[PDB]
């Protein structure tokens, strides 16, 4: 199906845009835990937050780590999971949360 | 800003479509309480669920009532609010939840 | 691909919407000719125009006919093809034209077989 | 008015994307003529074409110039306008044309 109309709506309204939500999953100690997730280049037109779902459990929406100098942004699952990383046998879903209307969009999923 | 390209992407992909999410807020007793919300004609291509947020407090997701033969669908806030209606002095935000990815989209908002 | 986000953007911005662009191809005399196209329920948020392309040849834009009381709108190819229908052996493409920015979107195609 | 749903649809389906359609208009000689337009980083998933409209006159579609090694792509108005630049007192509209369906999307406008 041809969705180029949607892409050129974004081109027309933003003109110059670069993003990279390729998930970079950071492991903890021991290595079987997933401690965090980094996106190399997030969108910055709003102060987006992130919601984390662990094995079907909503861990909530927390304060974002500041966007780093390279444009990356990191989500630290220890802030969502009571100070512990997430066992890599569990599904992890990460949603961006629009601060203006509260919408949320799946941007990463860990599932071994 | 001109979004006709998005509108006609939906036309080209769907061809014939009718929906009606005009919020019909159902009042309780006393009349100052809002007990529910009915949409006259919801989308039916998935088994959508609804999340309710009351004055910024996330009430979560519940099972949906069936789409009615006239196309309407009811969201009963008593199912979300521990058996109680919501005072109309509080903000009510209702999100449709996509079951394929868990995304949520604001479709109705009460705010005095 | 899951494009429900695009649909609910339209839901959120329009709230109540009904359209039907199922093509209804009207034939002339001889019945071999395609003389017009009717859409049962067009969008009406702007005074859209239509461009017609006849077997790859652009026939340009013309003023649109009024949207009818039942919601339908007719595109009359005699207006685009100097008073004659289009032989049904030719492909026909019909684009809606946004009057604000001049964008064009394919909304109907006639092609035999 | 909030279109983040559309933006994150593109994020979710494309994951990593960079484009730049900031118009770099090239003037001719004399300087009052607009001879061309360059986009620094175009989309490349289709062999897109360009339509040019000058002062309400549709000049049609032409062969696209190749996307260069740096990602940029140029629209030469002399190819559309019979060997002449466009006087800068006229409106210019440039549309990207989807080769799959012939749709056209405005990407640059002079006045």
TrEMBL record, chains A, B:
Domain of life of the source: Eukaryota
Name of this chain's protein: Immunomodulatory protein Ling Zhi-8
Gene3D superfamilies from the UniProt entry: Fungal immunomodulatory protein Fve (2.60.40.1790)
Any GO BP: regulation of immune system process
A Pfam cross-reference name: Fve
GO molecular function: carbohydrate binding
């Amino acid at each position: 199906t041809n969705d180029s109309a949607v892409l050129f709506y974004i081109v027309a309204s933003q003109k110059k845009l670069s993003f990279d939500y390729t998930p970079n999953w950071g492991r903890g100690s021991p290595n079987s835990y997933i401690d965090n997730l980094t996106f190399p280049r997030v969108l910055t037109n709003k102060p987006y937050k992130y919601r984390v779902v662990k094995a079907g459990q909503d861990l909530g929406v927390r304060d974002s780590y500041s966007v780093q100098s390279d444009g990356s942004q990191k989500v630290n699952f220890l802030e969502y999971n009571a100070g512990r990383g997430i066992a890599d046998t569990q599904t992890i879903q990460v949603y961006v949360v629009d601060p203006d209307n509260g919408n949320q969009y799946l941007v990463a999923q860990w599932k071994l």
